[PDB]
Amino acid sequence: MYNAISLIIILPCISWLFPLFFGRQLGYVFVTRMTSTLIIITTLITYYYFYQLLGNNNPINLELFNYLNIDYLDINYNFEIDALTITMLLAITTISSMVHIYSIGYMETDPHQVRFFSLLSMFTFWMIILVTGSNYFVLFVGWEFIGVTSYLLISFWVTRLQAM
Amino acid sequence: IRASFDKAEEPMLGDYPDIDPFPAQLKNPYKKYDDQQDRRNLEEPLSVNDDLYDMWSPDRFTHFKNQDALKYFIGFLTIFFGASYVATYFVPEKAAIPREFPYEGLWKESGGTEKSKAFFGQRSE
Amino acid sequence: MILAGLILKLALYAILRLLLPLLCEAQILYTPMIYIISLLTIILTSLATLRQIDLKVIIAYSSISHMGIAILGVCSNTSLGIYGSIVLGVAHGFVSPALFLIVGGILYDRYHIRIVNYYKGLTTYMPQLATYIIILSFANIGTPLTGNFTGEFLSLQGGFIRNPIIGGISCISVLLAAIYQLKLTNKLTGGISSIYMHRTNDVTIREKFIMNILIISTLIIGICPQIMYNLLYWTVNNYIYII
Amino acid sequence: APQLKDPWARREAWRYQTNFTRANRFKGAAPGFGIAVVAFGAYLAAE
Amino acid sequence: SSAHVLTKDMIQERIVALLESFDKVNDAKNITATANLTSDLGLDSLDVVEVVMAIEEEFGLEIPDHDADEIKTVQQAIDYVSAQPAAV
Amino acid sequence: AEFPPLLSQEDMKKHKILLAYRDRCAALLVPLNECRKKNYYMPWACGHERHEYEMCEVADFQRRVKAMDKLKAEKIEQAKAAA
Amino acid sequence: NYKWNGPLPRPHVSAGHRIATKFLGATMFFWMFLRIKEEYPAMLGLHNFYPPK
Amino acid sequence: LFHLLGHAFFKALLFMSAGSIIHSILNESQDIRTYGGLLSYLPYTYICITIASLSLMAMPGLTGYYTKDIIIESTYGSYSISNYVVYWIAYLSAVLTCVYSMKILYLTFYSNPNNNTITYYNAHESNIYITLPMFILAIFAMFAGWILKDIYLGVGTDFVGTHILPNNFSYFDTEFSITQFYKLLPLISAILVSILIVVLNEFFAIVFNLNNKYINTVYSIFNQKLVSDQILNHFIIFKGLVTSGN
Amino acid sequence: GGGRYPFPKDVISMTGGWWANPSNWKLNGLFATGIAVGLALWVSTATLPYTRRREGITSESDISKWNAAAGVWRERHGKISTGEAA
Amino acid sequence: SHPVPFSAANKKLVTSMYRQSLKLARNWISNRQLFRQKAVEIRHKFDQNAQISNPRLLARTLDETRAHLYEFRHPDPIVPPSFPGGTKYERNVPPRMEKIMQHNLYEP
C-alpha cells in the first residue's frame, strides 16, 4: 500500500479540494497546517524517490483510464516520473512547501487565508500534472489550469482594480 | 481629445450629447467622486465610446507620446539585431574541428540502410 | 435556454442527416466556401462581442462562435470532425443555458437590468454566484476537462486536416473566446460593490441545483468523452466520402 | 561661491549620526567572516 | 508584528519638533496648536509649502493642493493628519 | 596508443551508450557510469574514472586541434599558390 | 522615548537573529573558501588542455 | 535544466526576503528609494538576500556559478561560428546582474536612511514562519550545485538521456577550448563592477544624479520596459478594440 | 484579532468568509484528516496494479520478433526506407 | 491674459510649481544630500524671481517653468502605498454593511 507517484498526485489534490469544501467548518488555522503538512509529506516522497532513481533509473509509470480512443487517436491519462520530471518536481515540491510555511506568517491578518492556501496547492497539483504526464495532452491540461490558477491568485485582492 | 473613431460617429448621434472624451485614468484621483474606483459621478454624461475611456479600459501612458515610443522600441530592436549581424563579420576562427565518429558517421545507429547515409550519417571520422 | 441548447443544435443535426448522406459531391466541392463563412463567423462575432454592453447579448454571440467551430468540424470529411462537432453541441447545450440562467434569471430577477456598467463587485455579497460565473466562464472558453474543449480540439483537428491554413487560422478562437468572456468575468467578480446596486440574497438552492447539474454533465464528458462513442461509432463513418 | 545651507539640516542630521555613519552602515556586513576564516585555517591545519 | 498606532498628542509632538528644526521660523516658544504659519511663526508663502512637504515625508502621506493651501494653522495640520487612517 | 580500444557496435548497444559518447573513448565511460550508478552520482565518489575519461577525450581534442592546424596551413598554402 | 529628530538608539535585535545570521555567513564564506581551494585551477583556467606548440 | 533548479532556489529566496523587508517597514512600500539603512535592524533578512544575490552573481562555490558560467562558456564552445556574439550579450547580462543586485543591497541596507524615524523604531525581524524557509532555501542555494553537478553537468551522466544529435554535442570542446580570458573575464567583472557601483553610489553619487535631459530620457526608456508596454496597448489592444467597435 | 473590521454574517461561502475560526474546529479537523487519510490509502492501494517500470516488462526477443515481422510486412508491400529513393 | 504678480491665484500657482519641483527632485535623486542641494537651489531660483512686477515677463517665466517641469517629468513617481497610485490602495476594502433587500415573495 505504497505508491510514490499515486501519493504525489492525490495528496496535493486533497489539500486543494478539502479546504474548498470544508473551510467554514475547519477554519483558516487548521487549513494552513493541513495543506502545509500534506505538501510536506509530498516533498519527502520526492526526495526519497530521487534517491531511488539515482540507484536504478527505471522510471515508474501509471497508466489510467482512456480519455479518447476514437480513430487513430488514443489518449490515456498516463503518468510517469522520469529524470526530467523528478527535477522539475524537486523545484516545485520544495518551493511550494516553503511557501506554504512562509505564507502563514505573511498572510496572518488577512481574512481570506483559506482560499489563498487552496489556490497555492491547486497550482502545485497542476504543475505536478504537467511535469508528470506521459503525453502532450496531459501537459495541456496543466498548462491551462495553472494559467487559470494564476488569474485567481493575481486577482486575490478582488477589490484592487489593477490586480484584476 | 476627440479621436478618429469618436468623430466618425458625429453624423449618428442624433440628439445624444457630443461629449469630449477624457479617460478616467488621467482624472484627478484626489477628488471625491461618488464611484471612487471608476472615477465617475452619478449623473455624469457618457461618451458614445466610453467603454474605451473608463478605468477598465486599457491603460494609457502619459510620459512618451506613442509615435516617439514606436521610434524608440523599433530603434532599440534594430540596433540590437543589426549589431548582432555586423558582429558576425568580426568573428575569430574555431581552434579545433568538430568531433568525428568511428563507424562511418554512425549511420547504422542513427537508423541508416546503406543508401540514406546522406540523411542520417554523422561526421566522417 | 431552449434556443441556445437545442434549436441551434438542430442545424447541426440537419447537416448530418439531410446534407451529407446525400449531396456528398456538392459538399466536397463547396466545403471551402463553408470554411470562409465559418471562419468569418468565429472572428467577427468574437470581436463584435468585445464592444457590447448588454450581458445576455454577449453570451449569445459566444453561441454563434462555438457553432461556427462545430461547422468546421462536421464539414471536414473526417471522423474526429463529426465526433467533435457533436460533442460541442452537447457541451454547449449544457454550458450556455447555465450562463443564460445566471444573466437572465438571477441578476435580471434581482435588479431588473442587464447593462454591465451597473454590475461590479458581486464577489463581496454574492460569492457563490462568483464561483459559478468563473467555472462556467472557463468552461465556455474551452478549458480542458470540459466538453467545450474536447469538441474544440477535435473539430480543429479535422478542420486542419481538410484545409490546414483555415483550420489553423481558426485556432485563434481559443484566444478570442477568452477575451470576450474574461473582459466580462473580471468586471463582475472584480472591484468594489456597485453603488447603484443594493444587496440581495445569494443564489438559492433551485438555481444551485441547475448549475451543478449543467457543470457535472460537462465535467463528465470532459473527463471521459468516450462514453458517447457507443452511440456514434457508426455515425463517424457513415458520412465520410473518401475513396 | 556656489554654497548655500539648508534650513532643515538639524532635521536631516539624524541620517548621518550614530548607527548611520560610514562605519556602522558597513559593520554587520560579512557578518560571519572571521569565524569562517578561523575554521578554514583550522581545517587546512587539519589536512 | 506592526503593533503601532497614532494619537493626537504624538502627532502634535512630531509636528512641533519638525517646526523646531526649521531655521526660517521666527523663534521657538511661539509654536503651539493655535500657531499660524504666516503671522505668528513668520513664514513666507513658500515656507508653508516646504513645511507641508515635510509633514508628508514625516507621516507618510500625499497632500494635494486643495487640501494643502487651506492649511494655515498647526492644529489644522493635526486634524488633517488625524483624518487619514494611513498616517503612519 | 593514448586512446583505449574502440568498442564494437554490439557492446555499445549492450551498455546503451548515448550516440554523442559513442566514440573512440567509450571504453572508459562504461565503468564511470557504473561507479556513478553505484555511488548514487555523488561528486566525491568516482574521481579516478572521471579523470581517466576526461584525459582521454582531451587527447582527442588535441588531435582535432592539430588537424585544424593542418587545414589552416593547407589553405594558406593554396592562397599563396593563387597569387 | 522617541526622539523625533535625535540620534536614534541601536536596534534591539533578538539573539536567534544575531546567532543565525552569523551561522549562515560562516557557512557561506567557508563553503566559498573550501570550493575555491579545491577548484581554483578550473575557475582560473590554469590547466592548458591545448597541445604544446 | 540545472539552471532551472538553481534559479528556483536562489530566486524564491529573494522574494521571501523582499517580503520580510517590506513588512518590517510600516507602510508596506516596494520602493528602494525609501528603504535606506536597515542593515543593523534586519541582519537575517540581509544575509539571506545577499546569499541569493551572490548565487545570482556566480560567486565561487554557489549554485549560480556552476549553473550560469557554463552556459556563458558553451556560447564560445559551440561548433557554430556566429554564436560568439551571444557570449558577449550574455556577459553584458552578467555584469548587469551584479549591478542591479548590488544596487538593491546598497539602497536597502548600506545607504543613508530616506524614510521617517518611526519606521526605524518599529522595524523588526519577522516571525519563525518566515525565517525557517529562508534558512533552508539558503542551504540549498549554497550546496545543491556541487551536490548535483555530477548528475546533470557531468561527463557522460546518462541520467537525463535525451538523444542528443552527436553533431551538436560540444560539452567537451566547451570545457577544453575555453581559454583563461574567456574563463575569467565574467568572474572578474562580476566582482569588480559590483564593488565599483557600490563605491560610486556611496562616494560619488553625482554620477547617477546628473539631471541631464538626454540621460534622463534614456532612463525613461529603460523604465517602462523599453516602451513595449505602451506599444502593446496602443497599437495592438487599442487598435483591436476600435476595430472591434468598427 | 489584529487589523480587523466588521463584516456581514449572513454571507455564506463554502470557504470561511472573514477570519473563519469556529469554536469546534478540533473535531472537524479530526474528521477531515480521517477522510483524507482514508482517501489517500484507497487511492494508493487502487492504483498499485496499474503501475509498472518503464523497462523489464517486455523481453528483447519479443522485440526482435516484432521487428522481423515488420521487415516482412515492409517487403511484402514492397516498401523502402527513408532516403533510399535518391 | 492677466496673471497678476501679487494675488492669491498666482500664489496658488507658484506654490504648486514649487511642490511639483521638489517632488520631482525627490523622485529623480536617490541620495539625500543631493536632494537637499537641489531643493535649496530651487528655492534660490524662486526667491530670485519672486520680485517681478511686469505681468508679461512673469507669465513668460511661468511658461518656462512649465516647460522645465515637463522636461524633467518622472514616469514612476514615489507615492505612498495606501494612496491612489500605490501598491496597497484598495487591497482589503471593508465591505459596506448592507441589509438583504428582497426581490421575490417565495424564494430567499
Ligand SMILES: CCCCCCCCCCCCCCCCCC(=O)OC[C@H](COP(=O)(O)OCCN)OC(=O)CCCCCCCCCCCCCCCCC
Ligand atoms: C485587429 C484584429 C485582430 C484580429 C486577430 C486577433 C489578434 C490578437 C488579439 C488582439 C485583439 C485585441 C484584444 C483586445 C482585448 C482587450 C481586453 C481588455 O480590455 O483588457 C486589456 C488587457 C490589458 O490590461 P491593462 O489595461 O494593460 O492592465 C495593466 C495594468 N496593470 O489587454 C491584454 O491583456 C491583451 C490581451 C491580448 C494579448 C495579445 C498579445 C499579442 C502580442 C503579439 C506580439 C508579437 C509576438 C509574435 C507572435 C508570433 C506570430 C507568428
Ligand SMILES: CCCCCCCCCCCC(=O)OC[C@H](COP(=O)(O)OCC[N+](C)(C)C)OC(=O)CCCCCCCCCCC
Ligand atoms: C474543477 C471543478 C471545480 C472544482 C471545485 C471548485 C469550487 C469549490 C468552491 C469554491 C468556493 C470559493 O472559492 O469561495 C468563493 C469565493 C469567496 O472567497 P472567500 O475566500 O471565501 O472569502 C470571502 C470574501 N469575499 C466575500 C469578499 C469574497 O468567491 C471569490 O472570491 C471568487 C473566486 C472563485 C474561486 C474559485 C475556486 C477555484 C475553482 C476554479 C476551477 C475552475
